[PDB]
């Protein structure tokens, strides 16, 4: 990843603390971070080696190799600062399917990163598009099987790097709608109640494990992975806000496979035990006393789940100028996999959206109509055109200068079948 | 024939004290850090 040099260069000194409390900035950054300091992962799982005589396996675990009681603070840093939109469409869709069917919603995130002026050294994560997996979903909550998704998207993955794009975060819903008119929702998360629900920290903390970022100052050669969590909950008074959250680096790259589970508070998370398959320290935390303050007060089964979430703010860009947007077509179109509702179509929706508009009209429309995100997974997935055409298929849409390119892609012999095919079918 | 005593000095030990509570964190986490030039936030409605 070409960020993560860009700003080794640039010195910035940027970790002062009594600098970023003026800005009202709560931690730093990443890269700030990095120069302070020799990036070591810490390690809560028992040892095999020990240094010593005793067995590794059944009992035997000295002072010097013992996982200690865990303090439970705060990350004092974050990897990004602010995720960044591109188009208020595409939050606009996806709200769009809760409102057809009333149930909840799921999906993936594609976008890339740069760089983040406001922060010194800085990371501002720019989305591009949304993808949708299939999912069962209930008025609650929602859990798709395991297995049969995450053969999905070893292709998909495929699928997008060709055009510069990436998994970056993830997104799920919780609404909560009161009466639907006198109001838009109720508020379920806020500083009285719970901001991040257990059940879905393990599912956010597992997604960090498995998407590695790269560093050179570490010894396995990844540290502090990159993966934004985002909600669709709800604000204070009446509207529908987001919120944006990460999971804390020191545990959750560790102690979510193994001691980490949903009780039933959603402000909590039960706590679990091996019973000698590896070793489970204990947790101290704070609570404020009745008439004074207590020091040490619940060794077992209590630890918070908000001292293990660092914040994030979102934005959208500005309507009169921007860099670029890269995908604004229609944002209108069928995605994939919202067959609960009544947009999962066949070769009639191509009839009714495009069909090539205005057959030998124009070109400079048909630009603004073919660079939709699930518009070439859905014509890459026919696999009717050859290989070297959806390479020429990206640049038409994607790329900039795509006068030149567009006109080499309708002469040749790929896009001719297509629209053949198309009149033909309904 | 010679005699010395000692010079003493060596071992001391130091205290730590916390950082600041449960309920400031739960209250750093609910509020905003600003706009950067010029965004936006939220503006949408949903359920007809």
């Keep these: 990843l070409a960020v993560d040099e860009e700003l080794e260069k640039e010195d910035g000194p ?27 992962e810490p390690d809560f799982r028992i040892n095999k080696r020990c240094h010593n005589g005793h067995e590794p396996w059944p009992r035997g675990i000295c002072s010097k190799c013992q996982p200690s009681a865990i303090t439970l603070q705060q990350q004092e840093f974050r990897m990004v600062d602010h995720v960044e939109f591109q188009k208020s469409e595409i939050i606009n869709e996806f709200i769009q399917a809760w409102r057809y069917t009333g149930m909840q919603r799921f999906g993936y995130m594609y976008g890339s990163y740069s760089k983040y002026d406001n922060t010194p050294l800085g990371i501002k994560a720019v989305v591009e598009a949304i993808y949708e997996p299939p999912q069962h979903d209930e008025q609650d909550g929602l859990t798709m099987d395991v297995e049969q998704v995450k053969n999905e998207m070893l292709q998909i993955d495929r699928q997008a790097q060709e055009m510069g794009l990436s998994r970056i975060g ?26 991040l629900s257990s059940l879905e920290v393990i599912m956010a903390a597992r997604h960090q494990t498995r998407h590695p970022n790269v560093s050179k100052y570490s010894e396995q050669g990844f540290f502090s992975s990159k993966f934004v969590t985002c909600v669709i909950s709800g604000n204070l008074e009446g509207e529908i806000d987001i919120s944006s959250y990460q999971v804390s680096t020191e545990a959750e790259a560790l102690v979510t496979a193994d001691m980490i589970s949903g009780s039933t508070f959603p402000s909590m998370a039960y706590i679990n035990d091996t019973t000698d398959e590896r070793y489970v320290p204990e947790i101290f935390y704070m609570k404020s006393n009745e008439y004074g303050i207590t020091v040490k007060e619940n060794a077992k089964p209590a630890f918070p789940v908000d001292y293990l979430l660092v914040t994030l703010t979102h934005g959208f860009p500005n309507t009169d100028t921007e860099t670029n947007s890269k995908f604004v077509s229609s944002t209108g179109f069928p995605w994939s996999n919202r067959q609960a509702m009544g947009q999962s179509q066949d070769y009639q929706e ?30 890459n997935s026919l696999q009717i055109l050859s290989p070297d055409e959806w390479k020429l298929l990206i640049e038409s849409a994607v790329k900039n200068e795509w006068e030149e390119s567009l006109l080499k892609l309708v002469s040749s012999a790929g896009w001719q079948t297509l629209v053949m095919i198309l009149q033909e079918s309904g | 024939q010679i005699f010395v005593k000692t010079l003493t000095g060596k071992t001391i030990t130091l205290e730590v ?11 750093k986490i609910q509020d905003k850090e600003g706009i950067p030039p010029d965004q936006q936030r939220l503006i949408f409605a949903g359920k007809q």
């Design chain 1, 170 to 195: 993830l997104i799920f819903t919780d609404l909560s709608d009161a009466g639907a008119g006198d109001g838009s929702v109720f508020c379920k998360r806020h500083k009285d109640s719970f901001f």
């Design chain 1, 350 to 379: 191509l009839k009714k959206y495009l069909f090539n508009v205005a057959s030998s009209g124009d070109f400079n429309l048909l630009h603004e109509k073919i660079s939709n995100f699930h518009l070439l997974l859905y014509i």
């Design chain 1, 14 to 40: 940027p970790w002062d603390k009594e600098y970023h409390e003026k800005n009202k900035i709560k931690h730093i950054s990443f890269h700030s971070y990095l120069k302070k300091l020799p990036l070591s």
């Design chain 2, 17 to 27: 004290e916390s950082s600041d509570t449960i309920d400031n964190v739960k209250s």
